[PDB]
Amino acid sequence: AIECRVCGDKASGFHYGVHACEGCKGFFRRTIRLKLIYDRCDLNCRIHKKSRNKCQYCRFQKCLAVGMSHNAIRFGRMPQAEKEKLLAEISSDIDQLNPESADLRALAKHLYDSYIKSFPLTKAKARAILTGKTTDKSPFVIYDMNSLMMGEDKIKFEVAIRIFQGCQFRSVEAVQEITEYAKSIPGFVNLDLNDQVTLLKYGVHEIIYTMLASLMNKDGVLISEGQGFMTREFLKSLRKPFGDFMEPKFEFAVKFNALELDDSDLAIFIAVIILSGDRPGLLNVKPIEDIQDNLLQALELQLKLNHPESSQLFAKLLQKMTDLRQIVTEHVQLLQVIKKTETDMSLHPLLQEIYKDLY
């Protein structure tokens, strides 16, 4: 709940006179309980969760700066955890959250929550698994054509064509999960049903990649609720056409993740994708634009504070949107040339629906 005064991530309590992370804690003690002297530094190294162990002299400095002191070890259990439960500092909850800079912080929360329910495997569980800082059985890995043989994953309800199909499935499965999340967007279930659909007919694509970039990483992608992991190299080695399908996605993935966004953000960004007034074949547009503006206003704020340090991130994030079109339009070009020089399309109807006549 409460952030650490020094590095930033979740704090394990009030330690040495200040709320700090378990790491910053042990650091502080190891320091003074050994009276250590780290090399100086004229560089005010901004200490942050991601890069905190870069410079000691600065991590120790920030420590003291925020109050790290052995003269404040306030042992034991806390009396009026409410005087301080004034929302930590209601100096914003009613002072910063306004004029309407509270609906935004509410819409975000609303979306985020709605997001949590619609999507089984968020980015958090994903990055959890990938870094091993989880608790579950390591993902089985599919690296050989042999490793594949030993390949049974519960997808909700040739070899290349077999893998691709697996994709088909999840894609469909998610065209659904996304659908729900849409209904949950404020004012969506309202706009002309004709457009509502049109907005998914196009949104889904762009949303998928985004989704599928949390499951992905430089070396592979996660499969089956993240119980399995397929190597970027295995996929890159399939039959002529099929060996490329997955690359573009991996490419986009690496670039996108450089942004280091969390679920709190993909919830708002995902929305910003659906509600777009530049889709081909839309009727009443003012109402669509209408919402998007709001969400955007929400999103910018969301970032501005969630990721304080970074700069232009918001502008940058929006940028990827022009990148997602580049893909979808192209990805389709392939679907064309493919259905041509190949039989057994075995395409799911739902996808058949959304692929028929796009860009």
Binding site: Q176, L193, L200, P349, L350, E353
Partner: peptide
């Protein structure tokens, strides 16, 4: 059109 069955 199949989508209808989802949003409706």
């Amino acid at each position: 059109k199949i989508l209808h069955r989802l949003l409706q």
